[PDB]
Symmetry: C3
Subunit: 457 residues, 3 copies
């Protein structure tokens, strides 16, 4: 009796799970919204610098109209290698945002110290492989928030360790690995050799200096005891346990809610893969919500849900999409896009502005939202699936993405727009106000910037 080869089955549930972390795939939590949970872990925020520039260059004539295809190929080639290292070292990639990603090693409190050594080692091997890579690490208490409606779900992580990992990463120079103060306080200092950072309590890693008799492969093995989904045994040749997920319509119904419809179309083999890699003109609407205490999920969770319910209803009407949500700019940011594959309306600019205004007015009166700020910017952006075959997400990359984010941060409390949006919109000039030009971290020169003052006053 034969025992024939069983070919890998790439069921749709498995394809869906590539778009999500283990935190969601294996989370099985309640469908109530908001839902919050609490745990401890180590975070790694990894940023490839330079892709934002490459993006502008990939529009030039030398790319012969295959800029999008060439960009995504060279991006994924690099990001794939970073993803593999993260996964092999036992991390869970939570989210990709542009040319950056955030990874989590969730463990019990007693295990943080040892897992920090694992993540440092991982970081040093990533910084090794290689555009510059910058890595921020943090460790401690972490909250998760899941919010949404009956057809869409989103998650975010929240708390001091989350704020820290982003602060740590911004201090990083080309190729630095930076530890948050708490991470440094919790790590095995007898092994980790650091320099201090000026006017900063975070530290920089110089190297690992293991003691005699220390064997990293053995230490790692001990650490895998604490890793719930590390591939092992018959599945030790796989990068993710999620590669083994079997059809389950209840689970798939729950997981699909996190993935955009156009991605589900590709997964379902109802649209060519090539279709979603593009360099296309879009409008970015970047919404920031600030709270009195951005580390307190039980306060901010309801407010985020409330804002989300309104945001999604106005985006439906003005035809936009939420690409990504994350904690950023001392608050919760929604990266919204008008003109994704299949949503290209005319009057996109006008609508992006009226939508931004509606969101601004409504969110300003949600309880516990202290300040709303929205940046609107338009131009050619890269849209596509970024990452590894086994772990990847749809994202946007471009100078207008960064501009919209910087606008919302440097012009808090108002709706701002760039010149392309201003000039191209339908709206009368006196609905706007020309603003003082600010020097903005990561921005060569915006043309003129404007406040969208709106119809009255």
């Amino acid at each position: 009796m034969n025992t024939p080869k069983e070919e890998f089955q790439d069921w749709p549930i498995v394809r869906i799970a590539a778009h999500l972390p283990d935190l969601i795939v294996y989370g099985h939590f309640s469908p109530e919204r908001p839902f919050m949970d609490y745990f401890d872990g180590v975070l790694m925020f990894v940023d490839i610098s330079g892709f934002t520039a490459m993006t502008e260059k990939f529009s030039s004539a030398m790319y012969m109209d295959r800029g999008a295809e060439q960009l995504v190929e060279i991006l994924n080639y690099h990001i794939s290698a970073i993803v593999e290292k993260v996964l092999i070292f036992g991390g869970d990639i939570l989210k990709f945002a542009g040319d950056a990603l955030l990874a989590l090693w969730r463990v019990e409190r007693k295990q943080l110290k040892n897992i920090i050594t694992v993540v440092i080692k991982c970081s040093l091997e990533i910084h090794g492989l290689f555009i510059r890579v910058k890595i921020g690490l943090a460790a401690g208490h972490i909250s998760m928030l899941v919010f949404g409606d009956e057809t869409h779900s989103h998650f975010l992580v929240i708390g001091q360790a989350v704020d820290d990992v982003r602060l740590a990463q911004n201090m990083a120079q080309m190729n630095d690995v930076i530890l948050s103060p708490n991470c440094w306080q919790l790590c095995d200092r007898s092994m980790i050799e650091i320099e201090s950072v000026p006017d900063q309590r975070a530290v920089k890693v110089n190297f690992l200096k293991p003691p005699p008799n220390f064997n990293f492969d053995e230490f790692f093995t001990k650490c895998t005891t604490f890793m719930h989904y590390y591939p092992s045994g018959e599945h030790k040749n796989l990068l993710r346990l999620a590669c083994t997920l079997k059809p389950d319509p209840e689970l798939e119904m729950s997981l699909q809610k996190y993935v955009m419809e156009s991605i589900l179309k590709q997964i379902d083999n109802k649209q060519l893969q090539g279709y979603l890699s593009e360099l296309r003109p879009v409008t970015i609407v970047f919404v920031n919500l600030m709270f009195e205490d951005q580390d307190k999920a039980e306060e901010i969770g309801p407010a985020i849900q409330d804002a989300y319910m309104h945001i999604t209803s106005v985006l439906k009407i003005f035809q936009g999409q939420i690409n990504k949500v994350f904690m950023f700019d001392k608050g919760c940011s929604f990266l919204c896009v008008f003109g994704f594959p299949g949503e290209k309306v005319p009057d996109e600019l006008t609508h992006a502005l009226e939508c931004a205004m509606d969101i601004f007015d409504f969110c300003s009166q949600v309880h516990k939202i202290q300040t709303v700020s929205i940046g609107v910017a338009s131009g050619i952006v890269f849209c596509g699936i970024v990452g590894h075959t086994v772990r990847h997400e749809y994202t946007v990359i471009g100078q207008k993405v960064n501009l919209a984010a910087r606008m919302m941060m440097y012009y808090p409390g108002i709706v701002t727009c760039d010149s392309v949006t201003y000039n191209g919109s339908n709206l009368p000039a006196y609905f706007f106000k020309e603003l003082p030009k600010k020097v903005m971290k990561g921005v060569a020169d915006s043309g003129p910037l404007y406040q969208y003052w709106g119809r009255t006053e």
Copy 2:
């Protein structure tokens, strides 16, 4: 000198052969029609109960418009496992019909007794893996009929063993394996422990009770001597020898005639795979032809060919397709569909009715057809490729499929239709007659049913 890896080649001929049994793939018989052949074997009819209900549920809002994709995934996950067991145990899957399949172990007469033990073991391992599975087994003489025209071919098996396997399967309770009386008469009774079945000569299998020294792997090995296409040697890692078929335009011309054009389009990479999995509104026209003696291929073969020639010409004109033909309802049944992927006409209902009438009038005068009965039912049905990668077929599943079949059986000798068809058709009310409602095995409640009386009388 290198000896590089030879990658599997998925030539179009190999893709075509997934849609057919070995009985056809390796049959090399005459292209004359009808063609009949005669042999002996064991039949296994396997039915997954419950998918017909799942189908209705997969239309609900909770599936978020991915019902078809979710249905086919969970269906194939289960059916795939059953297919693998059948193939590993040396069976040839002849046909899929909805959530059921029919498999054949063709052998010489002297080998039936031993092969029955093999098939029982297979059945018990299938009933093991697991919606309820019901299995009917029969053994004996089998006739094959191939009918068609110069561009299309169809086959069917015929005879007492075929009638038996279907009778045996209908008696099965959830998870029973039932043997036909002849199978029980031919099997190795010293090994097989049964209970009797009330007012029935068929029996139920309780278990295999092998004698001392009996080793199933050795016994199976002996039995493979009689299996012409069991994968072996260098190909013992394959589920089917047909996976090794090499391009041959004469063979491919002959095999393609059994596969619908829209499936050939997908095989040819001229249409996305996703395209053919759908939950779509269709009209089922289920035609039953009864003969004086439904076990006698030399009598019924010509008549079936004759009916087929007419059926296919009227379906071409009213725009329908033959999905499947099989012996059923004490006769030969054609499962015909109006509105498959690419054939969606307006006035589909009217046309389905006029086509049904034309087929009824013509077939009623074909010599040797005793009674024609046709059931017409309309609604949302699942259409898609069901089975394993290496062995799968396009099929339809749904409550309106079952209704059309039950109508043709419980209202013999006339053309009947459901309420959706009646109400939606173009035709005047007096072309119909409202019928007495019958209690119908496998039907909760049809709305009102009608006879299509037609234009005169």
Copy 3:
């Protein structure tokens, strides 16, 4: 710590490289045009006879509109096997043209004699596998020319060895391997048993007669010292080193210039694979340029570039494409096609004729072009990707392709067209002249042939 399987990555650069030889993939030469380089090697020209006939047969009704799919399948099945043998024996496939291919073993001069024995052995194993295969071999000095503009590149090989391999191949009878005189002069005659060929200095191979103690596997191993890209070590399971190419946007920009846009669309997963295999009506415009000395790249290179610049600009305007360029008919031939996938214009015939005339007038005054001849023929031709997964190219095959080539050769110095083109064009009868019918090698019977005299005279 796991060491998971790394799946093959089929990056777009790797897909592009399937369409090119190692001579270009690993060439890294200047982007200036023309560019010429010089080396030595052995050439193998392999021709499958009979596919041109098969092509006409695959249009008949018996193929049920899947002629194109069936033709390409049976063609690639055979050509694939020849490609594998060439690659395993260390050859570089330079180009496919219809059902023929040209392969190169580039080496230093001292190594020609040994490499000739390798290529003879290869040839004998190819002639073995098997429509008739005919093989011509030549050896000596070879020039390469790369020509083009800022978005398109083409290469060609030139010189006496190139003329020889084509002459040798035309003398071959069914299943002969023929050596050019120089190849025979350079080979290891103590091992190679030949017959002479009448009124010919080329010879035919009867067999390899190795001496005692000669071991082909050891000899081959020694010879691989001289083969720069022979897959070895960790990559010895691959048919081509190019299968390992990694993303590199500079390299990909340079390589894509050789591949047509519609092929890049498929590579980019923006078009279904099936789309480019077709039997479609096209117009072939076959341009031949003769020079005083067709073996002298430094003279003819500039002229070819000059002609190319004009040809490509008129083809853009009359909507045609260069399919292939190669030395042929004592000159440089451009195989141009009107009506490829996506370029089907109305008045295609008229335009093909006016384009042919423009090219004829311009090329006749390029310095160093002695004679221009152009054959125009229209009908159903096979268009598709021919070859092996790892090495394949888009090509055209058909009786009208061969007719256009024979016309340009047998009616030098003028533009000629077939009857389909004449009758179907828009143009007045007196723009043409009906020509004397010539007996043409490889042509059963053209209908009437015409000169396109043009508007004046």
